[PDB]
Amino acid sequence: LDMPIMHDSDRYDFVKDIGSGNFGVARLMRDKLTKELVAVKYIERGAAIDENVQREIINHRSLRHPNIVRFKEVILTPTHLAIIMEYASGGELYERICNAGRFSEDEARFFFQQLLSGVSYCHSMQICHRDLKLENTLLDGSPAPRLKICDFGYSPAYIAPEVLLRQEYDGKIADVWSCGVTLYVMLVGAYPFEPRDYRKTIQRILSVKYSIPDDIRISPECCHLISRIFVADPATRISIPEIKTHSWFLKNLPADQSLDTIMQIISEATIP
Ligand SMILES: [Co+2]
Ligand SMILES: [Co+2]
Ligand SMILES: [Co+2]
């Protein structure tokens, strides 16, 4: 695996090297003081430490929210940049939906509320146009799992119409569309604009042609909400504040390292 020799064993115990899963290729360590598991992602020093990686780390550091994987620290290794972060031990939302087939409206609402909380928070930090696919929606190891968005660049239905049609677009409004796809898949157990023919799906996305199968019963209020997200015109698509006052959303709803140090470490990591 593309990882350096174990390091900083004075502060971390080595647990396991992961070749696939939740965090892709990653090393699991345990913080010696707090006893919490952390995930470590590694990037080779030099050219691979590019401006987008730098930007992503800095933005990751700024994002402090219970539904976004928490940045812990960066460490310089002789061969790699180490990016340490909160570990989420419950897999990803894709796997949970797959195992369940589909969610009840209560379970969909439980995760949707958390997703919207994370997304709304990113928007307030002027971070948007994110990759909010099911695979980047991680879960912690709680019985009622806490959702943990992890979209950071450390390695079809989701694409809104305007992203295909326009060169530039409103990233926050596009994110709302993505949130709708996640809601839909949780409720239905399949993607809204689909068998495997990309062209057909893109055509369906562009003309906003989806249908909730009769096979499953969804409340009319839930149908109305989805219909307000799957709107091709970004100007009239429902906003997150409007989602949060929608009848479906409200029903049975649960209650709602120094920067200079990081810059020096990242900067030095550019030297291979
Ligand atoms: Co975000
Ligand atoms: Co933005
Ligand atoms: Co991630």
Curated annotation (Swiss-Prot):
Annotated ATP binding sites: 18-26, 41
Catalytic reactions of this protein: L-seryl-[protein] + ATP = O-phospho-L-seryl-[protein] + ADP + H(+); L-threonyl-[protein] + ATP = O-phospho-L-threonyl-[protein] + ADP + H(+)
SMART domains noted in UniProt: S_TKc
Tissue expression remark: Expressed at low levels in seeds, seedlings, roots (especially in tips), stems, leaves, shoots, flowers and siliques.
Subunit annotation: Interacts with ABI1. Interacts with FREE1 (via C-terminus).
Task performed by this protein: Together with SRK2D, key component and activator of the abscisic acid (ABA) signaling pathway that regulates numerous ABA responses, such as seed germination, Pro accumulation, root growth inhibition, dormancy and seedling growth, and, to a lesser extent, stomatal closure. In response to ABA, phosphorylates the ESCRT-I complex component FREE1, which is required for ABA-induced FREE1 nuclear import.
Protein's name according to its UniProt entry: Serine/threonine-protein kinase SRK2I
The organism of origin for this protein: Arabidopsis thaliana (Mouse-ear cress)
